[model samples]
Target: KEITNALETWGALGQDINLDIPSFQMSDDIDDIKWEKTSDKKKIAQFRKEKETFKEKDTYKLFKNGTLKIKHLKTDDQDIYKVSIYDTKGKNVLEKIFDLKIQER
Candidate 1:
């Protein structure tokens, strides 16, 4: 199952954004976790023991709290971003969709 408390927000271009996620913890290791863009389901960020792995040409990073922190937002980054979290047992725990509208700042 997936948990979605909120899924819509507005942002401004050239501004910073922090996409925060709810509380979740893995007992052991992470089975699968990733963040994708709405346009093409492009992998924007993936969870790791360290922090996150972002794609090229994007000014975003993932924190340990499952927050996607973006610096100097751009037009291309103004879209929906989805986060999926799974446990080591291979069970999907969280799937969140966020609508980000850039105000062009």
Candidate 2:
């Protein structure tokens, strides 16, 4: 089965995997949004809130004009996974994933 949605919450998934999706765009009417990856708890929380806002506003569309990629990783040996997104500028737009569960056999 394939589940498809405009937006996905990282907190609801249970698995272990690695995904590397990248997006970019080339246009004159582009907003200069900078992005990066980090392991700071405080920054991760802040970015989560910001990412929610971005999803609601469909600001991600702006990236489509350039490139917008969503990468999801899951493994069966760990309870945590990493998630992130990047833009054409080679900047990380969003990158955070935790409290994930990986089913083991």
Candidate 3:
């Protein structure tokens, strides 16, 4: 179940993973979100509030445009990540996944 409906799956150790949610004509009502391991729903990263608040640091870092970047990746990072974007009411507006294949160095 780590694969399917993905824009594509595959990566390289030491490389990076960029999960950029394409921008829309308007804007998204991004209140809360989660990026999880596809197979186990393992928590990878959770969304932050405004600078009121905002943010994450490593294996994953969420950007202003909802783009999730995984830096200095490793083989263990290989696997599909399911992302869910929610509205203020906690309803999902976007649901997508990416199967990350890490080819070890």
Candidate 4:
């Protein structure tokens, strides 16, 4: 069965924020993990096998444990983000959505 969680997160301008999977379990047989800004239909970061890739290396990072770090929160960064994880056989194991809202500090 595939599990999905929808949640909200807030961050102040210029501060770094991390978005994480809810109650996640890590395993070595994982195949792919992807993060996207669904509001803009843009890819933020991704991990496959042991390689990690980001749309903007200085602004986004996808940790091996399924955590996404966004550096320097901005109005443009405020959006609904989605993550999908796949197993070794390309099965969608878990998915999560994050409603990211930015605030002025």
Point to the candidate with the largest TM-score.
4
Across 57-96, the per-residue lDDT of candidate 4 in tens digits comes to 6466777656777777677755688888887666788876
Error of 2 at 85 (Å): 1.3
How many residue pairs of model 3 clash at the backbone? 2
- For all predictions, the C-alpha RMSD in Å is 4.9, 12.4, 3.7, 4.7
- Clash count for each candidate, listed in order shown: 0, 13, 2, 0
Best by lDDT: 4
Give me the runs in candidate 2 sitting further than 4 Å from their true place. 1-79, 102-105
> What digit string (tens of lDDT, one per residue) describes model 3 on residues 1-105?
554677665676677777776564426456766667766867766674652233456766666546767787877655677878776556778787666675545
Candidate 4, run of 10 with poorest lDDT: 50-59
Q: Candidate 1: which stretches are off by over 4 Å?
A: 1-6, 24-33, 50-58
lDDT of each: 0.67, 0.32, 0.66, 0.72
Q: How close is every model to the real structure, measured as TM-score?
A: 0.67, 0.24, 0.70, 0.73
Count clashing pairs, candidate 2.
13
lDDT of 2 by residue, 1-105 (tens): 854322222422332232223464444333223222223422211122234424212211223222332234345322322445444344555444434343345
How does model 1 score by TM-score? 0.67
Q: Quick one: RMSD of model 1?
A: 4.9
lDDT of 1 at 55: 39
Off by over 4 Å in 3: 1-3, 24-28, 50-57
